[PDB]
Motif scaffolding. Structure first.
Motif, mmCIF file in Angstrom:
data_model
loop_
_atom_site.group_PDB
_atom_site.id
_atom_site.type_symbol
_atom_site.label_atom_id
_atom_site.label_comp_id
_atom_site.label_asym_id
_atom_site.label_seq_id
_atom_site.Cartn_x
_atom_site.Cartn_y
_atom_site.Cartn_z
ATOM 1 N N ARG A 1 0.913 -1.201 -0.038
ATOM 2 C CA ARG A 1 -0.027 0.050 0.011
ATOM 3 C C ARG A 1 0.902 1.212 -0.043
ATOM 4 N NH1 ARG A 1 0.382 -2.406 4.683
ATOM 5 N NH2 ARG A 1 0.606 -1.316 6.601
ATOM 6 N N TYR A 2 2.084 1.098 -0.477
ATOM 7 C CA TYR A 2 3.168 2.192 -0.567
ATOM 8 C C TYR A 2 3.459 2.512 -2.151
ATOM 9 C CZ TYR A 2 2.986 1.483 4.437
ATOM 10 O OH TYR A 2 2.488 1.342 5.647
ATOM 11 N N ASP A 3 2.765 1.531 -3.011
ATOM 12 C CA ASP A 3 2.872 2.006 -4.270
ATOM 13 C C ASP A 3 1.531 1.891 -5.048
ATOM 14 O OD1 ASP A 3 3.291 1.730 -7.195
ATOM 15 O OD2 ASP A 3 5.144 0.814 -6.745
ATOM 16 N N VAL A 4 1.054 2.871 -5.222
ATOM 17 C CA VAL A 4 -0.460 3.089 -5.765
ATOM 18 C C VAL A 4 -0.468 3.479 -7.121
ATOM 19 C CG1 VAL A 4 -2.720 4.166 -5.077
ATOM 20 C CG2 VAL A 4 -0.922 3.594 -3.375
ATOM 21 N N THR A 5 -0.876 2.740 -7.989
ATOM 22 C CA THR A 5 -1.327 3.005 -9.206
ATOM 23 C C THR A 5 -2.907 3.375 -9.388
ATOM 24 O OG1 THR A 5 0.611 1.693 -10.249
ATOM 25 C CG2 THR A 5 -1.227 2.380 -11.592
ATOM 26 N N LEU A 6 -3.164 4.514 -9.728
ATOM 27 C CA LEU A 6 -4.574 4.902 -10.058
ATOM 28 C C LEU A 6 -5.010 4.141 -11.050
ATOM 29 C CD1 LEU A 6 -2.964 7.546 -8.442
ATOM 30 C CD2 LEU A 6 -4.852 8.867 -9.752
ATOM 31 N N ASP A 7 -6.497 3.661 -10.822
ATOM 32 C CA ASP A 7 -7.214 3.020 -11.807
ATOM 33 C C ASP A 7 -7.700 4.191 -12.909
ATOM 34 O OD1 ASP A 7 -9.429 4.142 -10.999
ATOM 35 O OD2 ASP A 7 -10.090 2.059 -10.186
ATOM 36 N N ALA A 65 7.726 6.066 2.828
ATOM 37 C CA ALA A 65 7.623 6.720 1.588
ATOM 38 C C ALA A 65 6.415 5.944 0.660
ATOM 39 C CB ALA A 65 9.058 6.780 0.698
ATOM 40 N N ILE A 66 5.792 6.823 -0.157
ATOM 41 C CA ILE A 66 4.799 6.184 -0.920
ATOM 42 C C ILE A 66 4.805 6.997 -2.290
ATOM 43 C CG2 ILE A 66 3.035 8.217 -0.192
ATOM 44 C CD1 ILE A 66 0.799 5.889 -0.583
ATOM 45 N N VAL A 67 4.751 6.212 -3.166
ATOM 46 C CA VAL A 67 4.671 6.522 -4.737
ATOM 47 C C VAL A 67 3.303 6.272 -5.147
ATOM 48 C CG1 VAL A 67 5.619 6.671 -6.933
ATOM 49 C CG2 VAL A 67 7.219 6.205 -4.893
ATOM 50 N N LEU A 68 2.703 7.487 -5.908
ATOM 51 C CA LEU A 68 1.521 7.259 -6.363
ATOM 52 C C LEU A 68 1.673 7.343 -7.962
ATOM 53 C CD1 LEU A 68 0.579 7.531 -3.758
ATOM 54 C CD2 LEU A 68 -0.967 9.476 -4.412
ATOM 55 N N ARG A 69 1.074 6.827 -8.817
ATOM 56 C CA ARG A 69 1.439 6.796 -10.295
ATOM 57 C C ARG A 69 0.010 6.790 -10.983
ATOM 58 N NH1 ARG A 69 6.364 3.977 -10.144
ATOM 59 N NH2 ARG A 69 6.603 2.906 -8.341
ATOM 60 N N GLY A 70 0.020 7.633 -12.197
ATOM 61 C CA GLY A 70 -1.048 7.983 -12.870
ATOM 62 C C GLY A 70 -1.804 9.404 -12.860
ATOM 63 N N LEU A 71 -1.079 10.371 -12.073
ATOM 64 C CA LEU A 71 -1.646 11.526 -11.744
ATOM 65 C C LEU A 71 -1.620 12.316 -13.054
ATOM 66 C CD1 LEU A 71 -0.048 12.142 -8.337
ATOM 67 C CD2 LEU A 71 -2.601 11.848 -8.670
ATOM 68 N N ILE A 269 6.057 10.797 -2.176
ATOM 69 C CA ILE A 269 5.843 11.619 -1.005
ATOM 70 C C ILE A 269 6.848 11.002 0.184
ATOM 71 C CG2 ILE A 269 4.221 12.393 0.875
ATOM 72 C CD1 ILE A 269 1.923 11.836 -1.262
ATOM 73 N N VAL A 270 7.716 11.471 0.683
ATOM 74 C CA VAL A 270 8.715 11.166 1.504
ATOM 75 C C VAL A 270 8.292 11.751 3.041
ATOM 76 C CG1 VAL A 270 11.319 11.005 2.067
ATOM 77 C CG2 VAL A 270 10.364 11.442 -0.304
ATOM 78 N N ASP A 271 8.073 10.628 4.011
ATOM 79 C CA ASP A 271 8.015 11.124 5.314
ATOM 80 C C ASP A 271 9.392 11.591 5.837
ATOM 81 O OD1 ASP A 271 7.493 11.510 8.017
ATOM 82 O OD2 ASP A 271 6.377 9.607 8.287
#
Ligand SMILES: NC(=O)[C@@H](O)[C@H](N)C(=O)O
Ligand SMILES: [Fe+2]
Length: 319
Positions: A1-7, A65-71, A269-271
């Motif tokens: 849950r720290y690598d989130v690809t938007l559907d 850290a978390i990375v979101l993809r597809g923004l 996003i880095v804590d």
């Protein structure tokens, strides 16, 4: 849950929200009225993403850290990568929209007057002649650091949105979390890192050779799950044991770091309480096709810094 690809559905909705904010909101990103619009727009995001971000805020995990993809990023409309020092995003844009909405979701955006002129959305681009700088305009190896480590109200989160990837293939963001490092450190180093024997100056982005803060420990808070405050370029050890501690810490940051090559529409996003970051060496082209990230800092409790924020604004300065 720290690598989130938007559907596709969520990606399309955030795109719509970001366009609406960027094209219809009055004022510009550094204006309170625009940040307010961003805050309201955040609450239109899909619940799934809001829940993901809330979960990360509550617990940033073993890598912090978390990375979101597809923004949304307007790749076709994107101009050449800026090559000026102090480059910042003063005008409304999809990138400013995404960053400032997300900042309002995690806390509030903030910036520091002496750095990038206090802009809430700051460009991270290589600048000719700044290759050797330990900072956002450099392209030599960027040492591990907490962002603005010297500062009492240093960012709680650092957000990096990729507009244009490094086309050369050599650049990557590196993040190292103290949760990975601590169990591996020698007892003498751990003891050293809790002692007030480290002195830290502002990074060069603030100015050159600024005044160093009073001696203080690197590790903070809980003995098992501490925060940390260190910059391998800007933190000077006051004792011999502190020097060895920093050397061992550095080795373990390198050993435990996760390397990310960001692509357009990806948001790291880095804590900053628990995770240091750096960046690999690369050779810029300086032809407008280079790596382009945009960066926004998040304060989890903006109220704490009121004494530094004239008129209750988002720009922190002296006293
Ligand atoms: N040491 C740091 O915190 C750097 O990232 C600095 N804020 C910069 O933008 O160069
Ligand atoms: Fe940084």
């Amino acid at each position: 849950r720290y690598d989130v690809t938007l559907d596709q559905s969520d990606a399309e909705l955030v795109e719509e929200i970001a366009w609406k904010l960027a094209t219809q909101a009055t004022g510009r990103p550094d204006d309170a009225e625009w940040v307010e619009a961003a805050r309201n727009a955040w609450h239109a995001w899909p619940a799934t993403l809001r829940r993901d971000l809330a979960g990360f805020r509550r617990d940033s995990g073993p890598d912090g850290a978390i990375v979101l993809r597809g923004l949304p990023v307007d790749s076709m409309g994107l101009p050449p990568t800026p090559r000026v020092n102090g480059s910042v995003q003063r005008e409304a844009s999809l990138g400013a929209a995404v960053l400032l909405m997300t900042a309002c979701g995690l806390g509030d955006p903030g910036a520091f007057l002496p750095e990038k002129n206090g802009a809430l959305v700051q460009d991270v681009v290589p600048v000719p002649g700044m290759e050797e700088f330990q900072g956002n305009a450099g392209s030599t190896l960027l040492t591990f650091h907490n962002e603005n480590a010297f500062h009492e109200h240093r960012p709680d989160f650092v957000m990096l949105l990729c507009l244009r990837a490094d086309p050369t293939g050599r650049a990557g963001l590196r993040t190292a979390c103290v949760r990975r490092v601590l169990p591996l450190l020698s007892d003498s180093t751990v003891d050293a890192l809790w002692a007030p024997e480290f002195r830290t100056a502002p990074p060069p982005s603030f100015q050159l050779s600024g005044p160093e803060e009073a001696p203080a420990p690197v590790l903070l808070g809980d003995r098992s799950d501490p925060d940390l405050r260190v910059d391998l370029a800007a933190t000077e050890p006051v004792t011999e044991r502190a020097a060895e501690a920093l050397r061992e810490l550095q080795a373990h940051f390198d050993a435990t770091a996760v390397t990310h090559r960001l692509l357009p529409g990806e948001l790291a996003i880095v804590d900053n309480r628990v995770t240091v970051h750096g960046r690999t060496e690369f050779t810029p082209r300086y032809d407008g096709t280079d790596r382009w990230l945009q960066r926004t800092f998040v304060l989890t409790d903006l109220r704490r810094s009121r004494a530094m924020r004239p008129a209750d604004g988002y720009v922190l300065g002296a006293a």
